[model samples]
Target chain A: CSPGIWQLDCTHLEGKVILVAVHVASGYIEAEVIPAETGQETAYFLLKLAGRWPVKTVHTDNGSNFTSTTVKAACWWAGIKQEFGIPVIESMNKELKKIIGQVRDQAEHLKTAVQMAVFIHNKKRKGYSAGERIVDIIATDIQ
Target chain B: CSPGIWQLDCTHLEGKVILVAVHVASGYIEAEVIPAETGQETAYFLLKLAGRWPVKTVHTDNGSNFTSTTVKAACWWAGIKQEFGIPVIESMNKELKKIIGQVRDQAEHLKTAVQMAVFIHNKKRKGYSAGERIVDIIATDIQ
Candidate 1:
């Protein structure tokens, strides 16, 4: 409910797929180029996200990769809860499209373009960075 | 050309006027409630913006407040250049409107809502806070 809740969805670009995750409270985002829509790949991405922020709840749509046994097991082991429903990730997808479109040449470097797009998406202009917020949240959580 | 460059504009809400400034490179913003649209009032706001970040150039539409004698003199003294043109601040204004609309009571406390809106606007979600970016830019400037 705090820093750990996220809304996620996958978007396609230039024949490549990327999973996009949005931190619900902070509006921070994380994304990765997913070659395969396998549960293993999705779960690995979740683990990487958990490494950065204490990912508690991940809300996504009814995607097969998200519902797979491997993903469920990974979340179970990592103490992450999965929720299936409509996530407000369309905004993120739109932003991704806008950012990706800004890239000069997307044909040659789709992955790099997606990475830059996600990086730029998370940096909000006014408040704390998601990284800063997560650190503050963790510090407060301990306190 | 970088951290010191900004876009200036004003918007009215709930019978109050707020001056908004956006750092062009970093997408950082600063805003304040203005009681008057006078040259002196607007100049003072620019000074306050200069206090936080090295204000080199300000881009604005042909607003009287931005073109007044005091503002021009203040910018001249502060070593800031002024440019008249359309700024991409419409998106920021839209964001401010959205944030301001979310407030529970617009009739009672407009100033507080505007302040909170600007603060949230500056704290971006991903890469770096505008504050952090400024510091880094300054650090690199010296090197």
Candidate 2:
């Protein structure tokens, strides 16, 4: 269990599918652009994200893309738990929208765009932690 | 805006006032128990938290307390925006409920019990950071 829930979901930009997750409390964003929001893609990116961060409970409102057996097995394989965010938490949906809105005019690589968005987001949100980036905060913020 | 919102509110147990806040995405919790819930009382706790963390928009259902001219002025004075969680978010309400359920048996000191409960709650939610305590993470995480 973790202090915050990783709210995961997908959105489209310029017709490309983007998988995204953000810690509600920390505001650290984990994201990827995949072919589709299918269970396999979500599972794949989710596993990829888990390798980098400790994901406790995975909640998403877009269950359709993650309901395939492959995705469920991915969660089980990763030793993580899953839950549905019924009624949809409105704030989460807007998180990425704002990010994308900020730099939509740029045609940067998908991953680059998302990563840059995360960086700028953290930097602008000066209250995130002690250092310049969220990574710094996470590093300095150990036991 | 995301699909889920971290609804905030307050409750009284044994004549002690408790204010609790949580992000539905990260499940990151910020709470404190004080003498009262008037605008200023809650404002003090909120200002203290905002100083330590990245607080964007604040949403609370405890309008009765925050509606005070003093609280509204506090937010305005501090340059923080205020919003209400109308219709109720519902997710945050059940968060601490799970914790209080554990030590509800204790009839001793209210503040001690509540503080202990928050500590234990954060500790058990280990996906926190590098160690068992959440204070370190909160300390280093600035935004």
Candidate 3:
């Protein structure tokens, strides 16, 4: 699975909680500021915003926040299977370090820069087929 | 650096030696079929080839044949740096198992089948480029 980007600074600045949800398959991103990260709260928030979109599986790296009981229960209630990969996260972190180094030349706020990086990453990422865009076919469950 | 292919097969047919050299900057390959794997013979053979070309560095996995004092001495004499990746080789062995599974239906001999797989691999391999014709370049290099 590809990587997703999220921002953790929203709750402190807005006095409102925010979570960024990126569909790694489609590069579709939804960012919202919410009150908290409780299981019921997250589920309800997602239900309200996402409407009828069906999510079959959710994957995250082995971060304490990601592995929290609240997040797991939220996923369970949504009928979405949760998967985690610690080693892959380490690899992605190394990749992120290289990307951050390359983009530091652009003078912008770090959060804004990261958002821009995610945008560029999504736009540039492609499948093995020359004309295939990852975002276009990500919604298809075919392997 | 990205990955490349190398094959190591000791056919029961006695006294046959094979060496696979890959260029990292370009995925160029040089394969040599020699008669033996002895330290002295290998060193002499490599030195004769080195006389013809400028070898900046030589990279291999940590096989006893590669790490032997004779090989090291030859490298020193030729002003070449030797780098080894034993763990990476071990991991690659597991990956080779997966490739073997995928190609079992197409070819009779696993060795030749593996060569075909590597050909397809280098042809389709991409990192920063749209596509790369590595096998064509390798053929040109040999010619």
Candidate 4:
């Protein structure tokens, strides 16, 4: 079963927010580009996904918006579970990866780039590629 | 067995091309907004999917671009099979419906919107609602 842990990542930029959600039931990752990563913003998206799927827990790392009272309220009220992801090696490892120059950081560009990348990703496999793809999306299996 | 069809579409405006691809396996659909719907553009995306998945046959309807020499050659060489979707009961109907109209229709906004729409769509499912949204994107799928 897919855990449906909404891994939230908000990369701050010229005072804007690019929200990334990784929902792994298999293919496709969900992302949103909004102006702010406020409690209001995060809460809405969390609830939005909750309403759609059997999403019970939201696991995110240290983002001020996430820790705020607003976010806590949303989770508590929703009766959905929540967890925070601790900083992992990938965080610092990204530093060594050049991250990308300012040229690519523009919000929309990054979003579009992410979308295509995910498209390419679902198609990419190590041992056997494209074993199965674009298959049936969860079919009311939330129950 | 499933016949995966990758449908190609393009909207021209302001010296830019907004190409939309709809890939369907059974219950899931993935869309992409590229620069153009040219043969080179069509080839690359098709090949990308072809390379990434077991996509052997792509069925496209009455779009001159899809049937062009370039697209024909690309299909010929890639060894990917192709079938023409007849315009019955609006094959090119609302499937292209919610896919457009946003005021400006710039490349970035269109791409971002398309990305989010498809993103939300995956979350919206059979066990629930929000299935097929984004105005007219696959009208029957969302309900």
Candidate 5:
């Protein structure tokens, strides 16, 4: 049995930072902002947060943060397998870009727009895993 | 040596008529519009064009128009060598997508924008061919 995490990075307000992580098993997501774009430190934090999860695999596209040495080291320390998808193949990246474009068109606060988008994405969006509904897992897996 | 002609379909444009021809030896390009996107009609037109030149090889992407029975029969009858680029690697497809995106962003007439872009591209783009100057290629291509 293995659990997977999907990592994504975004730039909503030109320079503001937005990072998102999704749990593949339950489709649970966590989104946050970081003070900087440094790769190693970000990886260090992720590994610490996911401590002892026996991360069988982690997936990310070819983003600077994900490909950073610090993050790679952290994954190596945690005995996690890392897989990088094709640069444009990540659906989440496309979704984020779409939301960013929409927000830009509306002239909304980039940070606020990103946060709102993430909230809606996690709570309202439908998802699936291995052809089965994701909500079912969320409902039963979480206390 | 025999002359050949290749027909490419732009049906992905949803009924838009685009046909592209390239001289493999010199990398010269000739593009035009077709009345229909059907294979039979495309083949017929291609044959008429081929009659004007000594075509030894024909190349195209793997679209339905290129794979249709009429096209195959025409090629067989004309003794033209039919060749295909990797379905996804053809610069025609890549340039088409890029052109579409550019037109979308600029909100310009597709034909006008495409023509202008192609003109600029041919004039400014650098090639890796042995005799081509490094300066003539994109700045990024220089070592």
Candidate 6:
């Protein structure tokens, strides 16, 4: 399994906040439009993502929502490491934000818009130096 | 003066195309939503930008739009070198695309959307390893 932590951040669109978590190794992303951009909300999504994958560390910026005691305590229980500072900057996040905006503009529903965006992200775009989609990379379990 | 060529590409928003040229050394970008995403259009933007700065080379993908006879011919006239292949990829371009989408969504006009996007790109946003905005780096022409 990939050992490092995922990168986390929250972005806003049309006054609605979205929480995003990214796996840098595979360029896989999990994101959702959240009710708020707060520590409690960030922790909730972090744990949910941890349940799906083996997460050992979480990297984020110094945003109160990401560095709060609530988030730190949650990481403690999960035994996941935390690394922050230097303000988060990633080409992966940049691409994610673009894809989200593109999908949101076309879909009738917000939830589906985000879901379809993730789907398209994991399956369609050739990202970074991966030479293929995130799904293609993640699908290689035997490797 | 920086010794390397710039990275170039085209992006679209709301079906309107945009031409983008990036100075990788300084993370400076010049972009404008254009009438088309054709070789002719790409060359026009490329030459206009070359006039503002000393351009010795341009790097792009194998897109017919970027490698067309028109674009090649333009480069020849300016004595600018052209390098293309292996598909274009850049975190700077990723950030540019996101900013363009964000600005386009808010701006009332398309042309202004691109202009403001470039402005925000050169003024705001801490990108990559540059440690500052593109404008900050470019302002230091003395360097």
Better of 1 and 4 by DockQ: 4
TM-score of decoy 3: 0.29
Rank list by lDDT: 1, 6, 2, 4, 5, 3
lDDT of 2 by residue, A1-143 (tens): 24435778787777888777776546656556777667766765565445334556787766676678867765675566776556224464466567767765552455545544554454454543221343444445443
Question: Against the true structure, what is each candidate's TM-score?
Answer: 0.46, 0.44, 0.29, 0.44, 0.35, 0.42
lDDT per prediction? 0.64, 0.56, 0.41, 0.48, 0.47, 0.60
Question: Which pairs of residues clash in candidate 3, taking residues 3 or more apart in a chain or in different chains?
Answer: A17-A34
Question: TM-score of predicted model 1?
Answer: 0.46
lDDT of 6 at B20: 74
Predicted model 2 interface RMSD = 14.6
Model 3 misplaced regions, further than 4 Å: A1-54, A66-69, A84-90, A125-132, B1-143
Scanning candidate 1 chain B in windows of ten residues, the lowest lDDT window is B134-143
Encode model 1's per-residue lDDT on B1-143: one tens digit a residue. 36567888887776778787777776666666778667876776665455334577888764566667767765765567876554344578777788778752632456655654555555445566554454455445533
Alpha carbon deviation, residue A56, candidate 3 (Å):
2.0
Residue B58 lDDT (model 2): 70
Model 6 TM-score, 2 decimals? 0.42
Q: Count clashing residue pairs in model 5.
A: 8
Candidate that would win on TM-score: 1
Writing each residue's lDDT as its tens digit, candidate 6 over B5-124 gives 687877666777767778777666777777877876666555545433446788775456655886776576556786656423576657767876776655456765565556566545
Across B98-129, the per-residue lDDT of candidate 5 in tens digits comes to 65565444423343334333333333335432
Q: What does the interface RMSD come to for each candidate? A: 17.6, 14.6, 23.9, 9.1, 27.9, 22.1
* Cα lDDT tens digits for candidate 4, B101-130: 441242235444444444444544553333
CAPRI tier for the interface of model 3: incorrect
